[PDB]
Write a protein that binds this ligand. Structure first.
Ligand SMILES: *[C@@H]1O[C@H](CO)[C@@H](O[C@@H]2O[C@H](CO)[C@@H](O[C@@H]3O[C@H](CO[C@H]4O[C@H](CO)[C@@H](O)[C@H](O)[C@@H]4O)[C@@H](O)[C@H](O[C@H]4O[C@H](CO)[C@@H](O)[C@H](O)[C@@H]4O)[C@@H]3O)[C@H](O)[C@H]2NC(C)=O)[C@H](O)[C@H]1NC(C)=O
Ligand SMILES: *[C@@H]1O[C@H](CO)[C@@H](O[C@@H]2O[C@H](CO)[C@@H](O[C@@H]3O[C@H](CO)[C@@H](O)[C@H](O)[C@@H]3O)[C@H](O)[C@H]2NC(C)=O)[C@H](O)[C@H]1NC(C)=O
Ligand SMILES: *[C@@H]1O[C@H](CO)[C@@H](O[C@@H]2O[C@H](CO)[C@@H](O)[C@H](O)[C@H]2NC(C)=O)[C@H](O)[C@H]1NC(C)=O
Ligand SMILES: *[C@@H]1O[C@H](CO)[C@@H](O)[C@H](O)[C@H]1NC(C)=O
Ligand SMILES: *[C@@H]1O[C@H](CO)[C@@H](O)[C@H](O)[C@H]1NC(C)=O
Ligand SMILES: *[C@@H]1O[C@H](CO)[C@@H](O)[C@H](O)[C@H]1NC(C)=O
Lengths: 596, 49
């Protein structure tokens, strides 16, 4: 008959076979993550091999249907995904070499270890000891030496691999019709074929930089305040006008500033909002916390969980011989099977994490009716944003009072809100300049504007420029500092975190406004209102069928990301920071260098 | 899964032939635009309702 009819039949055969093969592979991954044994490793490999091999022939056979004969705008999307998700253009030797490089990068990152100076006696790993030292230790020498030692022993070995790695990825990208790997990553947000909603790959660079221009005043005031508090801790080392040393940010790479809350507390005399003791007094266990989390979801109108989740999901550490990865995850095995894997303790963080992980589960069931190739979020940022807005309303004092963990006698004043706002700012606002810079630097090197001999000169130049952080020890081209990061060494796109942060605050304002909320935005509860849940559920059930530009307009009435909701949320903190920066100069100086 | 036409009420069909979808003849073999019409279910105790 016609191309559309012939293509429609092919998808029907692929749709049924994919679900069965995907289910077996996912179950193998779940089996090993809970029962760490060598045979389950093999089961993961055997299941993974068949799933990977199956996606190869299907993509190859899908190339016989030209895309210009389809005008349904839905079969085209399904066919497009297959032709790019498993198709290989590199040669056999290059394919093997590229996989070997990636496998080497992942293994060396896990096996990379540094240890005490001038002593080969005892050595440790990054997660157990290095993270704790960077998070808590206040010794200048210990922090500075550990920062330098790990980078030297990890970046230098990974430097030659990265140079070979960028070569093959550009060759694969140039073999395709994309300009380069940088354009390859930016193609996720592209929307084509719809009038009034089209998006271009090159437009993303303009919008990302444009949004960062409006957030500059907020970040510098926080930087000025943080620098002032650091003076009371380390007087001699830090200059009032220079950049902060890179080894005094509370962690290994300075991604988050949450570790500095104790040092930079605005008002330490005021009590902190803590319910860990209250939960212990009321004798809360793993099941009660999750039942409470589930109840919050029902009150907005969303359906609550099935019997399969409760029977299958493990919510406590098995211990003994049974060892499992304790990192929280939201598992979607498909075919009506949903499970959550996380080790849970009686803390507020696990109480908040329970809401965070349940949000991803609810999103999964909304688009369960969509075809197999459309069971995903609109872009890489929407799925993360949904799981974060629910934690925003789960930490409000009003929600805690309603549950009963927080005493009704608790009062709110100047300092309870300001302290809470500064805690959130150190985590969200701090990472944004770091997030925007790292994705930017990877773009030029993939573009080829920055030569290899000037990777580090350009790297640290922007660190003193945008982030306003100066390295404590100079580094030549031998090191590979970006490769020391997990995402860079493992080839993961990093722009998804910049877009996610903007998206979550747009969603919260839309839901709070719909729920007829009044007052400050940071005190908002959406538990009782059923109108907010209905509006949110409309976007979730869409899946990948509609363009993300249209989906956003159905929620916030806009076709593009905006930063104004984020500033309004932090507006009360902005005015106070201006008051505290009356006598402190705003802005860092790029000329200063800690090492003379 | 595939059939040339619909079914009249209270009818059965056990014919198992390659459902031709392309213009060229299937010639009794599977492959490009030549799919088997019968597809099997999959039942496991962990499947959702
Ligand atoms: C085309 O082919 C590619 C593979 O080449 C497939 O792409 C994958 O898609 C999945 C689904 O999103 C991606 O999975 C995501 O990986 C993230 C990376 O996290 C790593 O690090 C953490 C520790 O921090 C590990 O635990 C984890 O296992 C990874 O090693 C995860 O962070 C993501 O989880 C997020 O969502 C869950 C909720 O589900 C949250 O709970 C988490 O906190 C987190 O926010 C997610 O699991 C995968 O990375 C993609 N691969 C690549 C290479 O990018 C496509 O699916 C395929 N196209 C198809 C099939 O159509
Ligand atoms: C692009 O192709 C898809 C897939 O063929 C089309 O979706 C199809 O839409 C029609 C009606 O819009 C659906 O028909 C309905 O079927 C149900 C039973 O499933 C029946 O109860 C309804 O009364 C109605 O007849 C059809 O099922 C659906 N196909 C699939 C696979 O879900 C889509 O319409 C096409 N796009 C355009 C613009 O035509
Ligand atoms: C949503 O409604 C429920 C029930 O109508 C509220 O639950 C009550 O909350 C008050 C606090 O204002 C408690 O004193 C009651 O004991 C609660 N009863 C029950 C049965 O839960 C809930 O507080 C409302 N949501 C919000 C955010 O106030
Ligand atoms: C884990 O794997 C072992 C070895 O295959 C098996 O005997 C055991 O039943 C599995 N499950 C648990 C919970 O130990
Ligand atoms: C939520 O789950 C409970 C079981 O714990 C059930 O009684 C209730 O009907 C469910 N709510 C909806 C809307 O189905
Ligand atoms: C504290 O709140 C009072 C409200 O009575 C206000 O007058 C005062 O300016 C506030 N101070 C600060 C530092 O926010």
């Amino acid at each position: 008959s016609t191309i559309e009819e012939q293509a429609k039949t092919f998808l029907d055969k692929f749709n049924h076979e994919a679900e069965d093969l995907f289910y077996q592979s996912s179950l193998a991954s779940w089996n090993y993550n809970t029962n760490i044994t060598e045979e389950n490793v093999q089961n993961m490999n055997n299941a993974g091999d068949k799933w990977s091999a199956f996606l190869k022939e299907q993509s190859t056979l899908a190339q016989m249907y030209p895309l210009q004969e389809i005008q349904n705008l839905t079969v085209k999307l399904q066919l497009q995904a297959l032709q790019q998700n498993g198709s290989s253009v590199l040669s056999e030797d290059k394919s093997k070499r590229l996989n070997t490089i990636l496998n080497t990068m992942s293994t060396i990152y896990s096996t990379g270890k540094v240890c005490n100076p001038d002593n080969p006696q005892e050595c440790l790993l990054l997660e157990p000891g290095l993270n704790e030292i960077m998070a808590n230790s206040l010794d200048y020498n210990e922090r500075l030496w550990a920062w330098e030692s790990w980078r030297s022993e990890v970046g230098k070995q990974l430097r030659p691999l990265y140079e070979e790695y960028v070569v093959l990825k550009n060759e694969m990208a140039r073999a395709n019709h994309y300009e380069d790997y940088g354009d390859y990553w930016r193609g996720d947000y592209e929307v084509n074929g719809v009038d009034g909603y089209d998006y271009s790959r090159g437009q993303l660079i303009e919008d990302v930089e444009h949004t960062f221009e409006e957030i500059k005043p907020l970040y510098e005031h926080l930087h000025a305040y943080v620098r002032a508090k650091l003076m009371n801790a380390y007087p001699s080392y830090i200059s009032p006008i220079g950049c902060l040393p890179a080894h005094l940010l509370g962690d290994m790479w300075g991604r988050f500033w949450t570790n500095l809350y104790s040092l930079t507390v605005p008002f330490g005399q005021k009590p902190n909002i803590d319910v860990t003791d209250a939960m212990v007094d009321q004798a809360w266990d793993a099941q009660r916390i999750f039942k409470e989390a589930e109840k919050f979801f029902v009150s907005v109108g969303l359906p609550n969980m099935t019997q399969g989740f409760w029977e299958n999901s493990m919510l406590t550490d098995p211990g003994n011989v049974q060892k499992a990865v304790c990192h929280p995850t939201a598992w979607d095995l498909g075919k009506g099977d949903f499970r959550i894997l996380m080790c849970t303790k009686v803390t507020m963080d696990d109480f908040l994490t329970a809401h965070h992980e349940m949000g991803h589960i609810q999103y999964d069931m909304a688009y369960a009716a969509q075809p197999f190739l459309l069971r995903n979020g609109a872009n890489e940022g929407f799925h993360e944003a949904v799981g974060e807005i629910m934690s925003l309303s789960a930490a409000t004092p009003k929600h805690l009072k309603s549950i009963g963990l927080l005493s009704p006698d608790f009062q709110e004043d100047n300092e309870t809100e300001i302290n809470f706002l500064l805690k959130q700012a150190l985590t969200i606002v701090g990472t944004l300049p770091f997030t925007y810079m790292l994705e930017k630097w990877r773009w030029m090197v993939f573009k080829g504007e920055i030569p290899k001999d000037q990777w580090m000169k350009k790297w640290w130049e922007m660190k003193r420029e945008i982030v306003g952080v100066v390295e404590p020890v100079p580094h030549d081209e031998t090191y590979c500092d970006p490769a020391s990061l997990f995402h860079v060494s493992n080839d993961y796109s990093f722009i998804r975190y910049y877009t996610r942060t903007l998206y979550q605050f747009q969603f919260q304002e839309a839901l709070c406004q719909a729920a007829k909320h009044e007052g400050p935005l940071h005190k908002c509860d959406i538990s009782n209102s059923t109108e907010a849940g209905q509006k949110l559920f409309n976007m979730l059930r869409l899946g990948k069928s509609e363009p993300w530009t249209l989906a956003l307009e159905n929620v916030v009435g806009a076709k593009n990301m905006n930063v104004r909701p984020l500033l309004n949320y932090f507006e009360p903190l902005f005015t106070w920071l201006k008051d505290q920066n009356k006598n402190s100069f705003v802005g860092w100086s790029t000329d200063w260098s800690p090492y003379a | 899964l595939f059939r040339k036409s619909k079914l009249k009420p209270f009818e059965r069909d056990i014919s198992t032939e390659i459902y031709q979808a392309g213009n060229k003849p299937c010639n009794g073999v599977a492959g490009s635009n030549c799919y088997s019409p019968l597809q099997s279910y999959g039942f496991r105790p962990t499947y959702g309702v």
